[PDB]
Amino acid sequence: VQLQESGPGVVKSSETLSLTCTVSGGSMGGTYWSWLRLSPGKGLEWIGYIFHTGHTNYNPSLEGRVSISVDTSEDQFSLRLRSVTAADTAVYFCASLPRGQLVNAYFRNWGRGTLVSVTAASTKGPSVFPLAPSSKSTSGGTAALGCLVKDYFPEPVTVSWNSGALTSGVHTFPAVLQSSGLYSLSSVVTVPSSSLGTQTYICNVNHKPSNTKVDKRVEPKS
Amino acid sequence: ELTQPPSVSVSPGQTATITCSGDKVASKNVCWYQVKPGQSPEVVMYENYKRPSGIPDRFSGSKSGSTATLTIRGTQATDEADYYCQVWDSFSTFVFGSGTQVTVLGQPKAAPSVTLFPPSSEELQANKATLVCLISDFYPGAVTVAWKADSSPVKAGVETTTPSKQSNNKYAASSYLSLTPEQWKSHRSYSCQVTHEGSTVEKTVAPT
Structure with a gap:
């Protein structure tokens, strides 16, 4: 049976x-x-x-x-x-x-x-927020800056970094189904903190379900 | 409710004991189910100590009481599962345990790295606030996230994920705390608190 x-x-x-x-x-x-x-x-x-x-x-x-x-x-x-x-x-x-x-x-x-x-129920475009560099990251170096992709539906979302020219040190976390009904993921990269201020970092988010493409620039705070 | 130890970890040689210790607990009869992801759950013990068809001898246990215990000797790797206990109830018919995650290493335990991000100014300009707690590189994959506003615990607006295997053979998870900017700015500090095994890591951010 x-x-x-x-x-x-x-x-x-x-x-x-x-x-x-x-x-x-x-x-x-x-x-x-x-x-x-x-x-x-x-x-x-x-x-x-x-x-x-x-x-x-x-x-x-x-x-x-x-x-x-x-x-x-x-x-x-x-x-x-x-x-x-x-x-x-x-x-x-x-x-x-x-x-x-x-x-x-x-x-x-x-x-x-x-x-x-x-x-x-309905297809939603993601909101893309920057996550300013901080430290507690994998030593120093070294900072961790990211992108919060909040409130989108449905999956999947693609987050690359600096148009893919950046692969080493990239951690994209799985999404979260919220009480909202909307997904939300974070993608953080770890970079030499000597390279801040000078080297540019952009997360490239694609949400084909809504035909949305956000290139968010992540600046250090001041 | 029938309380159970959220996670139990064991080296492939040693044995593991799981407790169901609720309120009734349960005047005699207790049953245990083994659950593995994408697989059909199955019985491993009933009444108290009876072992069903296809159960190796190492599975065992009984009530003290009032507390049933499931004991697995010489713990094998295929015994890595989520175990739930169950009793009959006059009113509710069936009452289940809180579940225990029996992980069975595996590899040496890894301590979690916690990375907490405060709300971006941009998000605050969109009248949203979200605190991001990123937990990574921990083994076994069973943690517990708790949020604190100043010192008071927080249960509302919290959304935590199920730990995911990484390429490192380790686990990663995120927890998000949703706030109105007013909440964020009115308190003095918020804190992501991550309990893995017996140890906890408490990161804290503040509005500036």
């Missing part, structure tokens, strides 16, 4: 997530067919379960926001989670429960796990 789920990769905020889950190598009866999810900040949690008869049991914490459908015809069971917020961003699994006494029970036959992110 396998278990494989599916659903949209992305869900726009305050809508209604909708997933389905397909069983293979067996039949539906005799087991509570459950939905769960996993994310840091909330840990692992049981969303709900359904029986092939149509009868359900949900998580109180959710509840009135969750609807679990079912289909005995085509070995599937569906999830429907309305009024979605940033907290609902998680890795969603479907699993199985041996029908019986539930104290001793545990989930078996988990699925691979879909991955749902709560976003902002």
